[PDB]
Amino acid sequence: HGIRMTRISREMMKELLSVYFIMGSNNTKADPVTVVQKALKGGATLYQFREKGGDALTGEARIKFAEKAQAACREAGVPFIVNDDVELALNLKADGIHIGQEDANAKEVRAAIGDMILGVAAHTMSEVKQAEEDGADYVGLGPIYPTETKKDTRAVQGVSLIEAVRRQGISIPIVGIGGITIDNAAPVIQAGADGVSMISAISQAEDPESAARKFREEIQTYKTGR
Numbered sequence: 001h002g003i004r005m006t007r008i009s010r011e012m013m014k015e016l017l018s019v020y021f022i023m024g025s026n027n028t029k030a031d032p033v034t035v036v037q038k039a040l041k042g043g044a045t046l047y048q049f050r051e052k053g054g055d056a057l058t059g060e061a062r063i064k065f066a067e068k069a070q071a072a073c074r075e076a077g078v079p080f081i082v083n084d085d086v087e088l089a090l091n092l093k094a095d096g097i098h099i100g101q102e103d104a105n106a107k108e109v110r111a112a113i114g115d116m117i118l119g120v121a122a123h124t125m126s127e128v129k130q131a132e133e134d135g136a137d138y139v140g141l142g143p144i145y146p147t148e149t150k151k152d153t154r155a156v157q158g159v160s161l162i163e164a165v166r167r168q169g170i171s172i173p174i175v176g177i178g179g180i181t182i183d184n185a186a187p188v189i190q191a192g193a194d195g196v197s198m199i200s201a202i203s204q205a206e207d208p209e210s211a212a213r214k215f216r217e218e219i220q221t222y223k224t225g226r
């Protein structure tokens with residue numbers, strides 16, 4: 001994955017969303033970069049650098065951690081997506097940026113990043129359609145299930161929005177997020193999602209590599225079966 005000179009295709013974007021690992025240093029008790037490396041080795045298809053909050057690294061320390069995580073992704077041949085930080089994404093030549101509703105304006109971000117991958121968090125039909133109109137390459141829908149990893153969370157919606165979006169004929173790449181585990185991932189794909197994203201199921205697993213591998217196998221099976 002080099003410098004993109006064209007918008008990513010729907011097909012490729014959907015493949016990348018399969019097992020979307022998201023992590024910051026405060027999401028694990030182990031060595032951060034090591035966990036990322038293990039998740040990639042196990043089979044994560046996309047990684048999002050999400051380092052924020054009172055327990056996260058800041059300044060130069062955060063930037064250096066970002067560089068190492070990006071290096072790990074490059075070694076695994078997996079794209080590196082930055083959460084919220086547009087400047088960081090541009091400075092590191094990340095493969096993409098993921099933003100939320102409270103964040104900035106998707107239209108503005110799309111203009112600033114050229115043909116880089118753009119993900120937008122959406123919780124309602126209106127937000128999903130607006131994200132598509134603004135030029136997002138994918139939307140993250142959730143919380144699907146209960147989760148404490150992110151406290152300022154919206155109401156749990158199961159796979160309701162995913163189904164609604166598909167029923168309306170919207171084909172934008174979708175990834176589910178929120179309390180997803182190997183045990184409850186299948187229904188997310190069955191509802192019409194193109195993959196699952198998670199933090200704790202992998203970051204806090206006693207065996208992150210095996211957890212990621214189990215996810216990879218499960219998701220592939222269900223994509224073929226739907």
Ligand SMILES: Cc1ncsc1CCOP(=O)(O)O
Pocket residue numbers: 142143146147148149150153177178179180197198199200201
């Ligand atoms: C970042 C985020 N956004 C909505 S729910 C959530 C947390 C995902 O963490 P976990 O996979 O551990 O529930």
Ligand SMILES: C=C1C=NC(C)=NC1=N
Pocket residue numbers: 020022048050083098100119120121122139140141142175176177197
């Ligand atoms: C809120 C989010 C929604 N979707 C994804 C993929 N990541 C997030 N951090």
Ligand SMILES: [Mg+2]
Pocket residue numbers: 084098099100101103
């Ligand atoms: Mg955000």
